[PDB]
């Protein structure tokens, strides 16, 4: 049972609006679904343009966006499955290009529906990503690359931005001028994204003029060159409005939704929102800009928001790059008790201004009450909802209504506990709490937190890579003070993940309760095991109010090891055959400053065991609002209430190139053996790593007179050469400099990389795709091309990722 959009007027690659034809095709699919058929809506492979003008329009109130604001209550939706079941939307590899401000696709009141096999983009994205390519502090100018997707007109020192236009009316969908309200910084050189001063864009401070240099480059002139702007070369400044007028995808009141094999190249307004939906599976989603664009923002805000859902939320085999908020947030909403009408009837209120106007309770749901101050449940407070009067989330009333989009009146099956009082207690819907399974994903290029999750059901975060999270890699809060986002946790497992280039704590557990309790804790039963943490000054774990917290069998490594062996005793020795000389070699092993790796704040029944700590890290524990009697380190080497620095005492090994000329024992005594010249090499072993140190050259004249590296594989993880030919100007490669940036008109290049240690593994990519690191002819696409070379030493632990970034000039 197949419905092709081609039979309803949507030709592939037509350049015409497909929105009316998709509506008709969905209509037919719904007819067949209502006959009991499993239906596929097929898109013959190609580009499809979907405009908002004729798209389905719905009044919708959406968690974590714009709250009750009536200016934005009406949503345009490009592909809407409503009130249906058993329908797969199969793009068959098509490219869907949306226009203006709209939601891309949605399912509402629908069961067993799937979206798969297409990309999602906008003609003119609403985040404007400007790369500074050159700055001239002497002339006080900067050269700014405006990606080809954007339209603009110049007027003196102003730039005016505009979208594309309606085919039906000629209306411009939106316009703006100069700096948009919010900006964040994607450093294309390092591949790190951070927030700085988000309300001050340095491209647009003290601009005196702008000139079009052609090829989509603008030369800005300034009355003064700030420090922020002087160091801006290679930075893509991602600027936008902050109003979340649309969800990017909306999955409201569904059951068994699957999204899979979708490339989200840009989402306007917000990310994928699940709301009051039972079971959503997300598999093989790639949020990120890719080859062929100079843009860098993929998400106007969050990528995945699961608000008040239930069943199982799965995110698997997916990748996340350059949102303007958290990649993943699974949570519910606390509503505050604002009126006790009777012992079985209360009014509750949406307290945060971006979440309001939709139902968080249906008849039959179970609720539980919480004391705001200590964020602990009221004992014996689970009740079943028997009646709901409040907003239905599409502008109408559930029950009698409440007279307000922020207020819901609940009737409960039995008298609530006497302790529950207005404004001191909140209510959580405990039916709409999901199990969470996030595994085999890649998170990078993110200015905020990687994963937020607050649910009482089973949570598994397993086998993910975190690189460059600007804030905590994993953040588990529970908040009835500012964000009003619910979910005390009861069963969390964080296992097999790798954290790299962490901008803050790798893992942060911090409910926002002001009052720290000695009887109970907010969260319980959290197990953090088998992860690898590369550390460089920030904590591994910062946990507040968790009981039965276990941290075991993890591996902690220095992210930037700097080891050597110095000599002092002359590096040049001449010997007579039979005589001996001793090397005065002393090992040098770098250590990581900053915080103790662990902090615990009001926790109970904490156990550390079986963890591996690299030399030179502060494997120690800070305690707050708790005693050491709640922390068990009997089976671990972490120290309570002390730094617990792992000693930086390296051992020294000695290997001669040619022992027929000169031999050496493991004390550093050279023995002249034969005539000739040879070099004896030192190596510093420090924990699981082995680095070379200074060498000694031995010259031995006539007279009448390796196995210490076994179990110590090499940790050399540098390149010795990196050549990129075919460019107007060449990079000045240095083994110690990882990151390079340039802009060039070249259409092709030849790249070759060589490891310092020929045994080390080199993995090279162009725009994420593997290339032959020994030598590859590469095509440079439109926009920003990124050649990455990752060298992994033979120890399997030490790696460096080099980046060569070229903006194409065309």
Annotated binding-site members: 244, 305, 325, 449, 485
809 Cβ neighbours under 8 A, 6+ residues apart:
215, 217, 743, 744, 745
Q: Provide the annotated binding site for alpha-D-galactose.
A: 244, 305, 325, 449, 485
Question: Could you give the 3-state DSSP secondary structure of residue 153?
Answer: strand
Least Å distance, CB 70 to Na ion, is 17
Least Å distance, CB 293 to Na ion, is 25
472-510 core/surface letters (b: 16 or more CB in 10 A; e: else) = bbbbbbbbbbebbbbbbbbbbbbbbbbbbbbbbbbbbbb
Least Å distance, CB 169 to Na ion, is 8
What phi and psi values does residue 48 have, to the nearest 5 degrees? -125, 130
Nearer to Na ion, 53 or 520 (CB): 53
The answer to whether 330 and 475 have CB atoms below 8 angstroms apart is: no
The answer to whether 716 and 754 have CB atoms below 8 angstroms apart is: no
Q: x/- string (CB under 5 A) for Na ion, residues 371-410?
A: ----------------------------------------
Residue 32's nearest CA partner among 83, 69, 79, 87 is 87
E-only strand ranges, 532-635 = 532-535, 541-544, 546-552, 555-558, 563-566, 572-576, 580-582, 586-589, 598-601, 606-609, 612-613, 620-624, 631-635
Region from 46-54, 240-248, 365-373, 454-462 binding Na ion, contact rule CB under 5 A:
46-54
Region from 51-59, 62-70, 295-303, 378-386 binding Na ion, contact rule CB under 5 A:
51-59
**Residue 451: HSE in the Cβ half-sphere, 13 Å Cα cutoff:** 28
Nearer to Na ion, 125 or 288 (CB): 125
Segment 743 to 782, residues that bind Na ion, using CB under 5 A: none
Region from 52-60, 377-385, 501-509, 527-535 binding Na ion, contact rule CB under 5 A:
52-60
Nearer to Na ion, 80 or 617 (CB): 80
Size of the site for Na ion (CB under 5 A): 2
Task: Tally Cβ neighbours within 10 Å of residue 731.
Answer: 15
Nearer to Na ion, 53 or 744 (CB): 53
DSSP letters, 364-432, are: T-EEEEEETTTTEEPTT--EEEEEEEEE-SSSSEETT--SSSSEEEEEESSPPPTT--TTTEEEEESSS
Q: What is the largest CA-CA distance in the chain?
A: 111
Least Å distance, CB 96 to Na ion, is 17
Considering just the CA atoms, what is the radius of gyration of the chain in Å? 30
d(Cα 7, Cα 699) in Å, to the nearest integer?
86
What phi and psi values does residue 72 have, to the nearest 5 degrees? -120, 15
792 Cβ neighbours under 8 A, 6+ residues apart:
717, 760, 761, 763, 798, 799
Least Å distance, CB 52 to Na ion, is 4
Residue 805's nearest CA partner among 792, 788, 790 is 788
Burial group, residue 366, by CB count within 10 angstroms (0-12, 13-18, 19+): middle
Nearer to Na ion, 34 or 171 (CB): 171
The answer to whether 556 and 618 have CB atoms below 8 angstroms apart is: no
E-only strand ranges, 730-780 = 739-744, 748-755, 761-766, 769-771, 776-779
Nearer to Na ion, 66 or 652 (CB): 66
Least Å distance, CB 144 to Na ion, is 30
Least Å distance, CB 271 to Na ion, is 22
Q: Interface with Na ion includes 234 (CB under 5 A)?
A: no
What phi and psi values does residue 718 have, to the nearest 5 degrees? -110, 165
Nearer to Na ion, 53 or 164 (CB): 53
Q: Which residues pair with 741 in a beta bridge?
A: 805
Least Å distance, CB 754 to Na ion, is 55
d(Cα 410, Cα 404) in Å, to the nearest integer?
14
Region from 48-56, 338-346, 374-382, 714-722 binding Na ion, contact rule CB under 5 A:
48-56
Nearer to Na ion, 52 or 67 (CB): 52
Least Å distance, CB 51 to Na ion, is 8
What phi and psi values does residue 284 have, to the nearest 5 degrees? 65, 40
d(Cα 133, Cα 146) in Å, to the nearest integer?
10
d(Cα 352, Cα 480) in Å, to the nearest integer?
10
Nearer to Na ion, 174 or 362 (CB): 174
Least Å distance, CB 75 to Na ion, is 11
Residue 101's nearest CA partner among 74, 81, 82 is 74
Region from 53-61, 250-258, 273-281, 524-532 binding Na ion, contact rule CB under 5 A:
53-61
Region from 44-52, 61-69, 336-344, 630-638 binding Na ion, contact rule CB under 5 A:
44-52
d(Cα 391, Cα 733) in Å, to the nearest integer?
62
Q: x/- string (CB under 5 A) for Na ion, residues 516-545?
A: ------------------------------
500 Cβ neighbours under 8 A, 6+ residues apart:
465, 466, 467, 468, 534, 559
Region from 49-57, 627-635, 664-672, 760-768 binding Na ion, contact rule CB under 5 A:
49-57
Nearer to Na ion, 57 or 582 (CB): 57
d(Cα 69, Cα 63) in Å, to the nearest integer?
12
d(Cα 810, Cα 148) in Å, to the nearest integer?
10
Nearer to Na ion, 76 or 618 (CB): 76
Residue 685's nearest CA partner among 644, 718, 719, 655 is 655
Least Å distance, CB 379 to Na ion, is 53
Least Å distance, CB 53 to Na ion, is 5
Least Å distance, CB 55 to Na ion, is 8
Nearer to Na ion, 168 or 642 (CB): 168
Output the residue with the shortest Cβ distance to Na ion: 52
Least Å distance, CB 80 to Na ion, is 15
Out of 22, 52, 113, 500, name the contact with Na ion by CB under 5 A.
52
Alpha-carbon distances of 485 from 330, 351, 477, 510, rounded to whole Å: 9, 10, 8, 12
Q: x/- string (CB under 5 A) for Na ion, residues 2-41?
A: ----------------------------------------
Nearer to Na ion, 101 or 244 (CB): 101
Nearer to Na ion, 164 or 553 (CB): 164
Least Å distance, CB 268 to Na ion, is 13
Nearer to Na ion, 101 or 581 (CB): 101
The answer to whether 618 and 596 have CB atoms below 8 angstroms apart is: yes
Region from 50-58, 294-302, 543-551, 732-740 binding Na ion, contact rule CB under 5 A:
50-58
Strand 776-779 to 769-771 pairing: unpaired
Q: Site residues (CB under 5 A) for Na ion?
A: 52-53
């Amino acid at each position: 049972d197949v419905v092709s959009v081609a039979d309803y007027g949507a030709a592939a690659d037509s350049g015409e609006d497909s929105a009316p034809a998709i509506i008709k095709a969905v209509d037919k699919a719904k007819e067949l679904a209502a006959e009991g058929k499993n239906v596929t809506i097929a898109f013959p492979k190609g580009r499809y343009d979907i405009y908002p003008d004729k798209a389905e329009r719905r009044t919708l109130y959406v968690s974590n966006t714009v709250g009750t604001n009536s200016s934005y209550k009406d949503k345009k939706i490009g592909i809407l499955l409503e009130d249906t079941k058993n329908i797969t939307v199969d793009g068959q590899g098509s490219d869907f290009v949306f226009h203006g401000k709209m939601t891309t696709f949605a399912a509402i009141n629908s069961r067993n529906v799937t979206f798969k096999n297409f990309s999602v983009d906008f003609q003119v994205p609403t985040v404007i990503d400007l790369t500074v390519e050159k700055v001239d502090a002497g002339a006080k100018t900067a050269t700014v690359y405006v990606p080809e997707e954007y339209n603009y007109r110049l007027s003196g020192s102003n730039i005016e931005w505009y979208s594309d236009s309606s085919p039906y009316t000629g209306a411009t969908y939106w316009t703006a001028s100069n700096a948009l309200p919010y900006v964040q910084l994607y450093d294309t050189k390092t591949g790190l994204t951070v927030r700085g001063d988000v309300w001050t864009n340095p491209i647009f401070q003290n601009v005196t003029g702008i000139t079009d240099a052609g090829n989509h480059r603008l030369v800005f002139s300034y009355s003064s060159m700030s420090d922020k702007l002087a160091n801006a070369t290679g930075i893509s400044y991602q600027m936008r409005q902050t109003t979340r007028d649309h969800p990017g995808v909306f999955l409201w009141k569904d059951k068994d939704v699957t999204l899979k094999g979708i490339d989200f190249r840009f989402l306007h307004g917000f990310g994928v929102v699940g709301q009051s939906t039972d079971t959503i599976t997300m598999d093989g989603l790639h949020f990120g800009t890719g080859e062929g664009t100079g843009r860098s923002t993929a998400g106007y805000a969050d990528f995945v928001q699961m608000s008040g859902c239930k069943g199982v939320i799965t995110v698997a085999n997916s990748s996340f790059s350059n949102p303007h908020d958290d990649p993943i947030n699974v949570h519910g909403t606390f509503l505050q008790v604002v009126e006790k009408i009777s012992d079985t009837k209360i009014k509750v209120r949406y307290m945060h201004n971006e979440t309001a106007g939709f139902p968080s309770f249906f008849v039959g749901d179970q609720v539980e009450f919480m004391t705001k101050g200590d964020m602990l449940p009221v004992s014996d407070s689970v009740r079943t909802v028997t009646a709901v009067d409040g907003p239905d989330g599409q502008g109408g009333d559930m029950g009698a209504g409440s007279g307000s989009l922020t207020d819901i009146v609940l009737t409960l099956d039995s008298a609530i506990p006497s302790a529950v009082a207005v404004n001191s207690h909140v209510v959580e819907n405990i039916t709409y709490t999901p199990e969470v399974n996030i595994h085999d994903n890649v998170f990078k290029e993110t200015p905020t937190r990687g994963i937020l999750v607050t649910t009482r059901k089973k949570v598994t975060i397993e086998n993910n890579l975190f690189d460059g999270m600007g804030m905590a890699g994993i953040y588990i809060s529970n908040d009835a003070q500012s964000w009003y986002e619910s979910g005390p946790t009861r069963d969390v497992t964080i296992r097999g993940n790798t954290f790299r280039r962490s901008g803050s704590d790798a893992i942060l557990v911090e409910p926002t309760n002001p009052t720290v309790s000695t009887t109970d804790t907010v969260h319980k039963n959290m197990t953090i095991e088998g992860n690898t943490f590369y550390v460089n000054g920030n904590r591994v774990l910062n946990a507040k109010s968790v009981s039965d917290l276990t941290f075991r069998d993890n591996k902690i490594y220095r992210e930037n090891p700097d080891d050597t062996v110095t000599l002092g005793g002359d590096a040049d020795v001449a010997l007579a055959v039979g005589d001996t000389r001793r090397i005065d070699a002393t090992a040098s092993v770098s250590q990581v400053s900053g915080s103790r790796l662990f902090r615990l704040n009001g926790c109970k029944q904490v156990v550390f065991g079986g963890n591996t700590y690299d030399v030179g890290v502060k494997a120690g524990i800070d305690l707050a609002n708790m005693g050491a009697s709640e922390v068990n380190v009997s089976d671990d080497s972490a120290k309570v209430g002390a730094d617990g620095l792992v000693p930086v005492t390296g051992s020294i090994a000695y290997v001669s190139d040619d022992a027929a000329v000169a031999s050496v024992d493991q004390d550093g005594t050279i023995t002249a053996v034969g005539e000739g010249e040879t070099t004896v090499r030192t190596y510093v072993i420090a924990g699981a790593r082995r680095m070379p140190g200074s060498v000694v050259n031995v010259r031995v004249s006539a007279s009448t007179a390796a196995d210490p590296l076994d179990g110590h594989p090499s940790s050399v993880a540098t390149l010795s050469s990196a050549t990129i030919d075919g460019l107007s100007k060449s990079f000045d490669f240095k083994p110690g400099t990882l990151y390079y940036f340039g802009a060039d008109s070249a259409l092709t290049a030849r790249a070759a990389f060589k490891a310092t240690d020929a045994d080390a593994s080199v993995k090279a990519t162009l725009n994420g795709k593997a290339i032959d690191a020994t030598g590859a002819d590469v095509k440079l696409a439109r926009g920003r091309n990124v050649i990455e070379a990752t060298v992994t030493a033979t120890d399997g632990i030490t790696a460096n990722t080099y980046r060569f970034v070229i903006d194409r000039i065309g």
